[PDB]
């Protein structure tokens, strides 16, 4: 699978790590579409052996939307796909806040069984990415706010 590309407007990204393609089409809700969905999950694309991808036809994504990929897919990109050409393959980039896709580690946080949306702040240290909580205001390392 080395020739393809250039199919329906929208855009497609590259360099999705392995096992990062899935669970990204869900946390950001992207399956909820009625058009050309052909993910490239579990398919090497370069230097590394394991990599995944995802493609979307007529569907642009705000700089802010793409930047919200960084944390998960730190080594990927975004090149506006229309049909043979490309308009700036902008890589993702750590946003100044991540909402709707992170649960707070503070069990006694008001935001868990409440009818509101999550929201964290961003800053790197040197070791991890401490995302701070919006409500409780306590700060955690991405590795902790990630899984559990």
């Amino acid at each position: 699978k080395l020739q393809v590309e250039a199919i329906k407007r929208g855009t497609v990204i590259d360099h999705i790590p392995a096992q990062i393609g899935f669970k990204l089409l869900s946390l950001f809700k992207l399956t909820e579409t009625d058009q050309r969905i052909t993910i490239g999950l579990n398919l090497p694309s370069g230097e590394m052996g394991r990599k995944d991808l995802i493609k979307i036809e007529n569907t642009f994504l705000s700089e802010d939307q793409v930047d919200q990929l960084a944390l998960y897919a730190p080594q990927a990109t975004v090149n506006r796909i229309d049909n043979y050409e490309v308009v700036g393959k902008s890589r993702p980039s750590l946003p100044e806040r991540i909402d709707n896709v992170l649960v707070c580690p503070n069990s006694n946080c008001i935001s868990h069984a409440e009818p509101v949306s999550s929201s964290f702040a961003v800053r790197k240290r040197a070791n991890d990415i401490a995302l701070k909580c919006k409500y409780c205001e306590k700060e955690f390392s991405h590795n902790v706010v990630l899984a559990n």
């Binding site: 006694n108 946080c109 008001i110 409440e114 009818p115 919006k134 409780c136 205001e137 306590k138």
Partner: protein, 310 residues
């Protein structure tokens, strides 16, 4: 008209430099000259989702001093809007349509911020949202220091006891960090040492600080002694007994302490202050609580009234 008009008092971090000195000035102006009917025809809900007869009597008192109606409750472990079946967001969506402002105390963190999202044009003052913030306690703390010492800068303040979980001492170190020249002596056990994140923001602003093991060392040079609250349930009862020495503060330790020095306490005390300290002029924890009605009177009159003539 008024920078703090129709604003939410959720955290000390949100309050800028001139924000804290504006409510401090308004607490000193209303204390100098009562405002019997400033907030007249204004209803204020005292929704205390966590029982606290200290803070609820101080808040509701200040509502009544400006001549404002009051309608609230105390969950007291049951409350009708709980036990899974009613969200906090629904409770505030209803209470907002009833009253002009909402003072709420929640056991969970971030409860006051969540209330602002469903309040709309109804202000939301935080009386204590778990272990997160307590800006109303911090407003009366600085106001008590500004009266006695006369300033909020170049002061040798120290914080004793439980600094690790003490939410009152966390927000106080950030509020006094907004001023210059302040010297800090965090006198706690190793198990209750001040968090690194508080020592990080101090290092950023170039503020001096030092960790001791007792009050005996620094008592010569201190203008404030903010003794904090320590729970027996925070740790073992054995390691609470030992290592607690010199965090008990006897009145026989005020020999060489400065004349202008004043001992502050949030208010609930038992071990950390001895009863013989009351007779000395240093003790100022009951006068601090009395100044808490003016800090909460300044907060309400600045958020509901458009101007502040006096």
């Amino acid at each position: 008209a008024n920078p703090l008009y129709q604003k939410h008092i959720i955290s000390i971090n949100d309050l800028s430099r001139d924000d804290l000195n504006l409510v401090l000035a308004t607490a000193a102006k209303l204390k100098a000259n009562p405002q019997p009917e400033l907030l007249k025809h204004k209803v204020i809900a005292s929704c205390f989702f966590e029982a606290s007869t200290r803070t609820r009597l101080s808040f509701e008192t200040s509502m009544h001093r400006l001549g404002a109606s009051v309608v609230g409750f105390s969950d007291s472990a049951n409350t009708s809007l709980g036990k899974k079946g009613e969200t906090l967001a629904d409770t505030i969506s209803v209470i907002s349509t009833y009253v002009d402002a909402i003072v709420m105390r929640h056991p969970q963190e971030g409860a006051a911020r969540l209330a602002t999202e469903f309040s709309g044009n109804v202000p939301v003052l935080n009386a204590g949202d778990g272990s997160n913030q307590h800006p109303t306690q911090t407003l009366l703390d600085l106001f008590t220091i500004q009266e006695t010492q006369g300033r909020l800068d170049n002061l040798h303040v120290a914080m004793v006891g439980d600094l690790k979980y003490g939410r009152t001492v966390h927000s106080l170190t950030q509020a006094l960090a907004k001023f210059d020249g302040n010297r800090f002596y965090f006198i706690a056990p190793d198990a209750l040492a001040m968090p690194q994140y508080i020592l990080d923001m101090l290092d950023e602003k170039g503020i001096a600080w030092s960790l001791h093991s007792s009050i005996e060392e620094v008592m010569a040079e201190v203008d404030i002694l903010y003794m904090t609250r320590v729970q027996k349930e925070r740790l073992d009862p054995s390691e609470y007994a030992n290592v607690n020495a010199q965090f008990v503060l006897r009145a026989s330790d005020l020999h060489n302490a400065k004349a202008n020095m004043k001992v502050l306490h949030p208010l609930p005390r038992v071990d950390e202050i001895a009863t013989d300290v009351d007779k000395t002029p240093h003790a100022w924890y009951f006068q601090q609580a009395g100044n808490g009605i003016f800090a909460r009177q300044a907060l309400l009159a600045l958020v509901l009234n458009r101007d502040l003539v006096l």
